[PDB]
Design an enzyme around this catalytic site. Structure first.
Site, PDB file in Angstrom:
ATOM      1  N   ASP A  73      45.095   1.544 -48.345  1.00  0.00           N
ATOM      2  CA  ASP A  73      44.521   0.765 -47.225  1.00  0.00           C
ATOM      3  C   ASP A  73      42.990   0.693 -47.246  1.00  0.00           C
ATOM      4  O   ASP A  73      42.345   0.688 -46.200  1.00  0.00           O
ATOM      5  CB  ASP A  73      44.996   1.309 -45.873  1.00  0.00           C
ATOM      6  N   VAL A 108      58.912  -5.115 -44.569  1.00  0.00           N
ATOM      7  CA  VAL A 108      58.982  -4.338 -45.807  1.00  0.00           C
ATOM      8  C   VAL A 108      60.441  -4.034 -46.118  1.00  0.00           C
ATOM      9  O   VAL A 108      61.241  -3.754 -45.218  1.00  0.00           O
ATOM     10  CB  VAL A 108      58.146  -3.031 -45.730  1.00  0.00           C
TER      11      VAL A 108
END
Length: 355
Positions: free
Chosen positions: A171, A41
């Site tokens: 998520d 990331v």
């Protein structure tokens, strides 16, 4: 008046932390932020929206059938969600100009700094702060549940909060939660409903209501509701609060061993929630009761909770949208890696950005 060509932006290539990053030039000043098994990331500045964003380079998205199917499933979910209490996808790209050269998937989202843990570390939340967050959680879950998606891993580490106390769910709907170890004194398993943690019966969207009940209670008391040192311990903690099951619930449980086990436990009455949550708003305690019901068939729905009196300051039926239908035919379907890769490529190339 109709587009024919997808015009392809200019990409630039660079290496940061031994990780090649090839991205459109609209994304400038990439900052490494971390690397799990779910991708590297970077923080980045998106020159088209002015937002600061998280760019996520998937790691090994196609190495097995299971993992190929996970890459597609996640990408399908992220694309589908368009609600301000749910993490949306703002962009998805690849450097590939054809399915033959196609290897990498990058995912672009709002950079979402703090999660509900970090929030509780820094302040004692006011009562209105708590109410406002349970409202937003229930609002985004109404959405999620409208499209027949089950979050399956709803917990404080999966909720991002901003400075104005605005909340997004992360998520949701993924198979990855099965990779965390759920044994011992672990937080992941602390928010799970008993029926999925002992596989009494199969999943159900009501499983997520159990989770928000556990979070609400934590937000009111500052204590984990059910911090069990193992499955059995956690179950005992649960049955103490809600009471041992009755006949109607036990016949819903398929395993013959698990019902023998339950009836071996000393029967207990349900506890008085007003004496368990001293000082709490009575409307808050009332709603907790309706979320923490052992038999999932009788748990409250998110759409019902939003209309419960606890939320009267925030509830508005005309600003609590439902999602469009989410086709999940693909979950029962048996493909090869290369075929899952091709369907992922097709959704990458077909992405339409938000207006």
């Amino acid at each position: 008046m109709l587009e024919m060509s997808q015009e392809r932006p200019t990409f630039y290539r660079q290496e940061l932390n031994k990780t090649i990053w090839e991205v459109p030039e609209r994304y400038q000043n990439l900052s490494p932020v971390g690397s799990g098994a779910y991708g590297s990331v970077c923080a980045a500045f998106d020159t088209k929206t002015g937002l600061r964003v998280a760019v996520r380079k998937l790691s090994r998205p196609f190495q097995s059938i299971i993992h190929a199917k996970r890459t597609y499933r996640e990408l399908r979910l992220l694309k589908h969600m368009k609600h301000e209490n749910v993490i949306g996808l703002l962009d998805v790209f690849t450097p590939a100009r054809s399915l033959e050269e196609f290897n990498d998937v990058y995912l672009v989202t709002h950079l979402m700094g703090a999660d509900l843990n970090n929030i509780v570390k820094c302040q004692k939340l006011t009562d209105d702060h708590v109410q406002f967050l349970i409202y937003q959680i229930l609002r985004g879950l109404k959405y999620i549940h409208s499209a027949d998606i089950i979050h399956r891993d709803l917990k404080p580490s999966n909720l991002a909060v901003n400075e104005d106390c605005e909340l997004k769910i992360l998520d949701f709907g993924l198979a990855r939660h099965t990779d965390d170890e759920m044994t011992g004194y672990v937080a992941t398993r602390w928010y799970r409903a008993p029926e999925i943690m002992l596989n009494w019966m199969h999943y159900n969207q009501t499983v997520d209501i159990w989770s928000v009940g556990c979070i609400m209670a934590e937000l009111l008391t500052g204590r984990t509701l059910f911090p069990g040192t193992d499955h059995i311990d956690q179950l005992k903690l649960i049955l103490r609060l809600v009471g041992t099951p009755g006949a109607e619930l036990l016949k819903k449980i398929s395993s013959e061993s698990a019902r023998n086990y339950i009836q071996s436990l000393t029967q207990m009455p349900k506890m008085n929630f007003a004496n368990v949550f001293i000082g709490a708003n009575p409307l808050a305690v009332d709603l907790l009761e309706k979320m923490l019901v052992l038999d999932s068939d009788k748990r409250i729905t998110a759409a019902q909770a939003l209309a419960h009196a606890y939320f009267a300051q925030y509830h508005d039926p005309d600003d609590e949208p439902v999602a469009d239908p989410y086709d999940q035919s693909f979950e029962s379907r048996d493909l090869l890696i290369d075929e899952w890769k091709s369907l992922t490529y097709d959704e990458v190339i077909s992405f339409v950005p938000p207006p």
